[PDB]
A paper describes a structure:
Lysosomal integral membrane protein 2 (LIMP-2) is encoded by gene SCARB2, and is also known as scavenger receptor class B member 2 (SCARB2; refs 1, 2). The most notable function of LIMP-2 is that it serves as a lysosomal sorting receptor for β-glucocerebrosidase (β-GCase), deficiency of which causes Gaucher disease, a lysosomal storage disease in which glucocerebrosides accumulate. LIMP-2 binds to β-GCase in a pH-dependent manner, and dissociation occurs in acidic late endosomal/lysosomal compartments.
The most surprising observation is that we can identify from the well-defined electron density that the sugar attached to N325 is P-Man9GlcNAc2, the first time this sugar, which bears a terminal M6P, has been seen in a protein structure. The D3 arm of the glycan arches over the side chains of H150 and R153 that cap helix α4. The phosphate attached to O6 of the terminal D3 mannose is stabilized in the C2 crystal form by capping the N terminus of helix α5 via hydrogen bonds to the amide groups of R153, E154 and I155. In contrast, at pH 6.5, the helical bundle is very well defined and similar in both space groups. At higher pH, the α4–α5 linker (residues 151–152) folds towards α7, such that α5 tilts about 20° towards α4 and α7, making the bundle more compact and further stabilized by the C-terminal cap of α4 formed by His150 and Arg153. In contrast, H150 caps α4 at higher pH and seems more likely to act as the trigger for the markedly altered conformation of α4 and α5.
Residue numbers in the entry: 37 to 430
Write the structure that this text describes.
C-alpha cells in the first residue's frame, strides 16, 4: 500500500507538489517567413524553422489553504522562465523573426465582431500597417508596444498597448485552483475540482465539452494501470484532454508507462463538434480554434507541423514537415507512484488568416491556418533523485 502519496502537511508528496524539485524546460521554435510579399499576392507561404530558445522554469504553489479538513486544497501555480543562452540557438534579444502582425489581425477580428469597430477602423485607415512584421524573439514572447494598440489605449485604458505570446506570464499563475488531495481516495489525487471558483467551463457548446477532467498535468494518481485512460486539464489549451497508453519505457532504473495524446483528441468528429463554435463547424482534423479564450484573437492551436492533422494543412504551408519522433506529445509515468519521469509536452500556435476586401492589409492572401511558433515543455529525472526514489520506493 502507498498512502504515502497524499497531499498533507508533513509528507514529501506535499513538499514536492508545493515546491517541485525537478527542473522543467520550455524550448520555443519559431517559423520565420521567407516570402511575405509573395504571400500577399496569394502565393504559397514558405517558412523556416528557427530555434530552440530554451528557458528553465521556476515553479511553486502559493496561497495554499487546506479545505474540508484535508480533502480539498486551494492554491495558485506560479511559474517563471530563466533564459539559458548556451542551450539555445542564439540570443532572443537580438534574433529577429519575421511573421504575422498579430495585434492588427486581432483588432480586425474585433472590428468584424463589432467590438470597437469604428475606433479600430479609423486608426488602421489613418496609420497604414504591414501584415508581416519583424521583431526580436524576446519581443514576440514577452511583449512589445504596438502602434495600433497604443492608439486604442488612449481611448480605452482597459486595452493593453503591449502584446506578446507570453505577455505578463512570467512570475504569475493561471488562476485560482482548488485541488483534490488523495485523502478521500488515492485515485482522486491532485485532481481538479474548480478553477476561478467554477467547477466547469462555459465557452464550449456541450456540457460534456465544458467539463474539467483530470489533474493540472504535472503529476498523477498512484498505481496506474496500462488499461486506463488519463485525463488532464491544461488551462492554456482551453479544454480538458485525455492521454492513452502507448508502450513500455525505462527511465533510469524506474518502470514507466508511455502515455501519448491520441489523434481522437483533435479529430473532425461529431464528438469534438462541440469545440467548433458557433454551429459545430470544424476546420478539419488536428487543430483547435481558441479565439474565445484568447480574447477574440484568431488563434488556432495545433500540434507541431500539423502532426496528426489533415494533410491539406501541411500542404498549405511550405516548410511543414511533421514526424512523430520530433513532434508528438508524450509523457513517461512511473506506474507505481503516478509520478512523471520524462515528458515532452509539445504544441503549436497558429493564426487563421484570410483575404478581406474592406482591409487592403490582407492583400490577396490565401485562407489558411498560419503557423507562428511551437514549443516543447520537457522534464527528465536525474540520477540522484531517481535512485533516491528507487530506494525510497523499497
Ligand atoms: C473561431 O471561434 C470564434 C468564437 O468561438 C468565432 O467567432 C464567432 O463567429 C463569428 C466570427 O465572425 C461571429 O459571428 C458574427 O458576429 C457579429 C457580431 O456579433 C456581435 O455583435 C452583434 C451586433 O452588435 C452591433 O450591432 C447591434 C445593432 O445591430 C448593437 O446591438 C450592438 O451594440 C453593436 O453595435 C455596433 O456598434 C459599433 C459602434 O461602436 P464603436 O466602434 O465604438 O463606434 C458600430 O460600428 C457597429 O456597426 C454596430 O452598430 C450582436 O447582435 C451579437 O449578439 C454579437 O454581440 C455579427 O455581425 C455577425 O452577424 C452576421 O450575420 C448577419 C445576419 O443577421 C449578417 O447580416 C451580417 O452580414 C453579419 O456578418 C455574426 O453573428 C461571432 O461573433 C464570433 N464570436 C465570438 C465570441 O468571437 C470564429 O469565427 C471562429 N473562427 C473560425 C476560423 O472558425
Ligand atoms: C522572469 O522572472 C524571473 C524571476 O524574477 C527572472 O529571473 C531573474 O531575472 C533577474 C533580472 O534579470 C536576474 O537578476 C539579474 O541577474 C543577472 C545574472 O548575473 C549574476 O551574476 C552576477 C555576477 O556578474 C551577479 O552580480 C548577480 O547577482 C548576484 O550577486 C548579488 C550581490 O552581489 C546578489 O544579491 C544576487 O542575488 C546574485 O547572487 C547575478 O547572480 C545580473 O547580471 C543582473 O544584474 C544586472 O541587472 C540588474 C537589473 O535587473 C541591474 O540592477 C544590475 O546593475 C545589472 O545591470 C541581475 O541581477 C535574476 O538572476 C533572475 N533570477 C533567477 C532565479 O534566475 C527572469 O529573467 C524573467 N524572465 C523573463 C523572460 O522575463
Ligand atoms: C528571419 O528572417 C529575417 C528576414 O529574412 C532575417 O532578418 C534579417 O536579418 C538580416 C541579418 O541576418 C538583417 O541584415 C542585417 O542588418 C543589420 C542592420 O541593417 C541596417 O544597418 C546597416 C548598418 O549596419 C545598414 O547598412 C542597413 O542599410 C540597415 O539599415 C546590418 O548591420 C547587417 O549588415 C552586415 O551583414 C553582413 C554580415 O552580417 C555583411 O554582408 C554586411 O556587410 C554587414 O556587415 C545585416 O545586413 C536584416 O535587417 C533582417 N531583415 C529584416 C526585414 O528584419 C532574420 O535574420 C531571420 N532570423 C534568423 C534567426 O535567421
Ligand atoms: C523537445 O522537442 C524538440 C523537437 O520538437 C527536440 O528537439 C529535437 O530533438 C530531436 C532529438 O534529438 C532532434 O532529432 C534529431 O535530428 C537530428 C537531425 O540532424 C541533421 O543533421 C545530420 C548531420 O549531422 C543529418 O544526418 C540529419 O539527417 C539531419 O539533417 C539528428 O541529430 C538526429 O538523428 C539521429 O537520431 C535519430 C533518432 O530519431 C535517428 O533517426 C537518426 O538516424 C540519427 O541517429 C535526430 O533525428 C531534432 O532535430 C531536434 N529539433 C530541434 C528543432 O531542435 C528536443 O530535444 C525535445 N526534448 C527535450 C527534452 O528537449
Ligand atoms: C470529461 O468527462 C467525461 C468522462 O471522461 C467524458 O464524457 C464521457 O464520454 C463517454 C463517451 O465516449 C461516455 O460514455 C457514455 O456512457 C453513458 C452511460 O452508459 C451513456 O449514457 C452514453 O450514451 C455514453 O455511452 C461517458 O459516460 C461520458 N461521461 C459522462 C459522465 O457522461 C467527457 O467527454 C470528458 N470531456 C472532456 C472535454 O475531456
Ligand atoms: C468534418 O466532418 C464533416 C462531417 O463529419 C464533413 O462534412 C461532410 O462532408 C461530406 C462531403 O465532403 C458530405 O457528404 C457530408 O454530408 C458532410 N457531413 C456533415 C455532417 O456535414 C467534413 O468533410 C469535415 N470537414 C472538413 C473541413 O474536412
Ligand atoms: C504547514 O507546515 C506547518 C504545520 O505545522 C506550519 O508551520 C505551516 O504554516 C504550514 N504551511 C502550509 C503552507 O500549509
Ligand atoms: C474522488 O474520490 C472518490 C474515488 O473514486 C470518488 O468516489 C469521489 O466522487 C471523488 N470525490 C469528489 C469530491 O469528487
Ligand atoms: Cl533515460
Amino acid at each position: 500500500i502507498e498512502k504515502k502519496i497524499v497531499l498533507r502537511n508533513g509528507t514529501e508528496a506535499f513538499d514536492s507538489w508545493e515546491k517541485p524539485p525537478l527542473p522543467v524546460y520550455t524550448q520555443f521554435y519559431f517559423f520565420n517567413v521567407t516570402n511575405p510579399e509573395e504571400i500577399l499576392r496569394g502565393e504559397t507561404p514558405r517558412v523556416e524553422e528557427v530555434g530552440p530558445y530554451t528557458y528553465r522554469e521556476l515553479r511553486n504553489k502559493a496561497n495554499i489553504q487546506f479545505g474540508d479538513n484535508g480533502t480539498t486544497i486551494s492554491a495558485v501555480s506560479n511559474k517563471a522562465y530563466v533564459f539559458e543562452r548556451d542551450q539555445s540557438v542564439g540570443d532572443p534579444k537580438i534574433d529577429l523573426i519575421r511573421t504575422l502582425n498579430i495585434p492588427v489581425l486581432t483588432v480586425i477580428e474585433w472590428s468584424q465582431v463589432h467590438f470597437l469597430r469604428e475606433i479600430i477602423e479609423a486608426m488602421l485607415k489613418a496609420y497604414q500597417q504591414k501584415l508581416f512584421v519583424t521583431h526580436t524573439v524576446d519581443e514576440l514572447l514577452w511583449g512589445y508596444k504596438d502602434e495600433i494598440l497604443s492608439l486604442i489605449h488612449v481611448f480605452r485604458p482597459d486595452i493593453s498597448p503591449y502584446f506578446g505570446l507570453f505577455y505578463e506570464k512570467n512570475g504569475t499563475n493561471d488562476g485560482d485552483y482548488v485541488f483534490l488531495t488523495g485523502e478521500d481516495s488515492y485515485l482522486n489525487f491532485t485532481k481538479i475540482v474548480e478553477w476561478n471558483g467554477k467547477t466547469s467551463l462555459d465557452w464550449w457548446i456541450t456540457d460534456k465539452c465544458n467539463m474539467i477532467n483530470g489533474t493540472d498535468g504535472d503529476s498523477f494518481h498512484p498505481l496506474i494501470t496500462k488499461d486506463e485512460v488519463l485525463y488532464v486539464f491544461p488551462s492554456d489549451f482551453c479544454r480538458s484532454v485525455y492521454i492513452t497508453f502507448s508502450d513500455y519505457e525505462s527511465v533510469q532504473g524506474l518502470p514507466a508507462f508511455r502515455y501519448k495524446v491520441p489523434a481522437e483528441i483533435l479529430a473532425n468528429t461529431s464528438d469534438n463538434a462541440g469545440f467548433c463554435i458557433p454551429e459545430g463547424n470544424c476546420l478539419g482534423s488536428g487543430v483547435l480554434n481558441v479565439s474565445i479564450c484568447k480574447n477574440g484573437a484568431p488563434i488556432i492551436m495545433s500540434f507541431p507541423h500539423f502532426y496528426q492533422a489533415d494533410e491539406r494543412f501541411v500542404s498549405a504551408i511550405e516548410g511543414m514537415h511533421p514526424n512523430q519522433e520530433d513532434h508528438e506529445t508524450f509523457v513517461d509515468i512511473n506506474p507505481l507512484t503516478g509520478i512523471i519521469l520524462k515528458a515532452a509536452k509539445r504544441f503549436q500556435i497558429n493564426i487563421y488568416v484570410k483575404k478581406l476586401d474592406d482591409f487592403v492589409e490582407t492583400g490577396d492572401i490565401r485562407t489558411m491556418v498560419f503557423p507562428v511558433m511551437y514549443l516543447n515543455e520537457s522534464v527528465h529525472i536525474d540520477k540522484e533523485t531517481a535512485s533516491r526514489l528507487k530506494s525510497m520506493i523499497n
